[PDB]
From a paper:
Co-crystallization experiments with DNA were also carried out both with CI∆58 and CI∆43. One of the crystals diffracted significantly better, however turned out to contain only protein (DNA was absent). Furthermore residues beyond Val80 were not visible suggesting that the better diffracting crystals were obtained because of limited proteolysis occurring during the long crystallization period. The resulting crystal structure is essentially the CI-NTD domain, well described in12, but contains six additional C-terminal residues compared to the previous structure, and is hereon denoted NTD80. The six additional residues mainly consist of hydrophobic amino acids and interact closely with the rest of the domain. The extended region is stabilized by hydrogen bonds of the Phe75 backbone carbonyl oxygen with the side chain of Arg8 and the backbone amide of Val77 as well as Met79 π-interactions with Trp71 and a hydrogen bond between the carbonyl group of Met79 and the backbone N of Ser68. The extended CI-NTD crystal structure as well as the NMR relaxation data also precisely identifies residues 81–89 of TP901-1 CI as a flexible linker, while residues 75–80 should be included in the CI-NTD. The crystal structure of the CI-NTD fits well within the envelope in terms of dimensions. Next, we generated a large pool of possible conformers (400.000 copies) using the crystal structure of CI-NTD80 and the model of the dimerization region. The MOR binding has been suggested to take place in a region including part of the scaffolding helix (α2), and a region including the last two helices of NTD.
TP901-1 is a temperate bacteriophage of Lactococcus lactis that enters either the lytic or the lysogenic lifecycle when infecting a bacterium. In the TP901-1 bacteriophage a genetic switch exist, and is regulated by two divergently oriented promoters PL and PR, three operator sites on the DNA (OD, distant located operator; OL, left operator; OR, right operator) and two proteins, the Modulator of Repression (MOR) and the repressor, CI (known as Clear I in λ phage). CI from TP901-1 consists of an NTD responsible for DNA binding and a CTD responsible for oligomerization. The full-length protein has been shown to be a hexamer in solution, where CTD is responsible for the oligomerization state of the protein.
Numbering used by the authors: 1 to 80
Write the structure that this text describes.
């Protein structure tokens, strides 16, 4: 596709003034809620586009940031 998960995370970091450390912080309550872990290292791998998130982390980050899963995956759809 045209857009990556990497691109979307970067779009959110810029538009919402969040660094990776902030996003990771926001996710922790949801990590415990869902019982699904996201480490700092793995998050940077998503941002730098070295790794693409599995469907577990797509859901996690999407609920954390309040965006749609499809959007977060890079698809050309509405954000909310």
């Amino acid at each position: 596709m045209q857009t990556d998960t990497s691109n979307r995370l970067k779009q959110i970091m810029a538009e919402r003034n969040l660094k990776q450390v902030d996003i990771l912080n926001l996710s922790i309550p949801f990590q415990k809620k869902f019982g699904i872990k996201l480490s700092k290292s793995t998050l940077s791998q998503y941002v730098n586009s070295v790794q693409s998130p599995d469907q577990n982390r797509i859901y996690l980050l999407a609920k954390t940031l309040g965006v749609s899963e499809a959007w977060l995956m890079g698809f050309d759809v509405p954000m909310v």
